[PDB]
Design a protein around this ligand. Structure first.
Ligand SMILES: O=C(O)c1cc(=O)[nH]c(=O)n1[C@@H]1O[C@H](COP(=O)(O)O)[C@@H](O)[C@H]1O
Ligand SMILES: O=C(O)c1cc(=O)[nH]c(=O)n1[C@@H]1O[C@H](COP(=O)(O)O)[C@@H](O)[C@H]1O
Lengths: 256, 256
């Protein structure tokens, strides 16, 4: 098993994956903050304070009450300062012709500021083809949703295998997965795992939690995605540090 | 087989489905316009001119360059005038806790103006539970995506059966399907079918077309969803009338 720093140099590595893996090893962080807030000021204050602790900040631009492209300009300044990627968790899931416009255009202009986006594989590979026609020229990357954290997920068995095949056949643009576990045996591909908290439990709407030690150490994923376990805590910086240290040690111990 | 007007009276009919079925029979239209445009002025000019020909106008609010909630106020005026429903084709596809905020909040406030939205079933039933916590109080309806039109779609076999079960278990909120065919045997549920053109063909990004006669007449669906077959034509009103007459006659001939 290669370190993040060695994976950053693999021959077939995507440039966005390489940038991410380098800053993960430099900063000793494999934590992605899920910045699930409705206020731009809270998003930016979290990005600035937690920036040093995270490899990535995941957005849902469509729940921000006061979105403007200028908010995203300020987020990019913080991402460059503290060295983290911006991942818009848009879960594109339409025909190729539609998703290319949803990615490039409208009010959000996602491709103009998001290093990474993700897509569901259920529509077939046209979803990736449509996104890549915007994303390749803008030097972006994409994650495919191979497994989900929620109760009753149908992203299992042949579905997960189809996501891995689709990623591996679009390696010019697809840099990894949303998954609960290592699903690809190819080390060029990132595994990001949501549904993470230190304590056992879930929410009232089908979310299920596993610990950083379980998903990084036992299930072999690379990065934990954490929302409420950080966001709902009083001290979000100390919560982020708890999650960072948990995910980083689980990674080191798997490396041996 | 019951007429649209008789289905509007079924004991278990959802109020949004009833309103739709009534105006379909009154206006002799089972056409949904896919208003896939980037300009508010073009969206509103199409809604006004084609309003009399359609039972429904389907939006992708996130490809509109000049979206404002005031554009949607003007669209509601036209929907009330000409009698059609507004369907935002957002394809919610996240955990329940996330989709409730994407539906109610952010810049778009989708639930404030959309009669109908749709969701993918791949995350499990929490996606429906989250949406219904916003949509039930706002007297809205939802469609579940049981089949897709695009090449390589994984929405087949057990996946399609899971979508039908999920709809039937959330009939307080779910009023039907995006599908290529009749998938539910319960007449209270609407079937809306995209991937429709009069001529054989497809697009360069995995879209596949079937005719109104095939999907309404042979496959037993209720409503055709048509984008480029209308939008790219010079005379969009005559194109809409061609599609309306095709879908309506296919429906009548299946009724016998
Ligand atoms: O794509 C995601 O990040 C995602 C996929 C998935 O399977 N489960 C999942 O929870 N997520 C997202 O990750 C975050 C989880 O947040 P918490 O449950 O608060 O930690 C939310 O923003 C979800 O939208
Ligand atoms: O939900 C939809 O309407 C949808 C589902 C599907 O399986 N296929 C499909 O094409 N659509 C949408 O319906 C429209 C099809 O447009 P045309 O191919 O131009 O007629 C697009 O806006 C798609 O986003």
């Amino acid at each position: 098993e290669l370190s993040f720093g060695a994976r950053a140099e693999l021959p077939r590595i995507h440039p966005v994956a390489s940038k991410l893996l380098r800053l993960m090893q430099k900063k000793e962080t494999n934590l992605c903050l899920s910045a699930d807030v409705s206020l731009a000021r809270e998003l930016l204050q979290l990005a600035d304070a937690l920036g040093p602790s995270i490899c990535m900040l995941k957005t849902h631009v469509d729940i921000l009450n006061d979105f403007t492209l200028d908010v995203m300009k300020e987020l990019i300044t913080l991402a460059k300062c503290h060295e983290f990627l911006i991942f818009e968790d848009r879960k594109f899931a339409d025909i190729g012709n539609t998703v290319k416009k949803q990615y490039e255009g409208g009010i959000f202009k996602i491709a103009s500021w998001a290093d990474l986006v993700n897509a569901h594989v259920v529509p077939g590979s046209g979803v990736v083809k449509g996104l890549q026609e915007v994303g390749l020229p803008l030097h972006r990357g994409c994650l495919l949703i191979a497994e989900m954290s929620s109760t009753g997920s149908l992203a299992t068995g042949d579905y997960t295998r189809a996501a891995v095949r689709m990623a591996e056949e679009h390696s010019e643009f697809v840099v990894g997965f949303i998954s609960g576990s290592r699903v690809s045996m190819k080390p060029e591909f990132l595994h990001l795992t949501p549904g993470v908290q230190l304590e056992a439990g879930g929410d009232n709407l089908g979310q299920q939690y596993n610990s950083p030690q379980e998903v990084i150490g036992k299930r072999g994923s690379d990065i934990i995605i954490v929302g409420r376990g950080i966001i709902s805590a009083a001290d979000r910086l100390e919560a982020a540090e708890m999650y960072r240290k948990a995910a980083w040690e689980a990674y080191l111990s798997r490396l041996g």
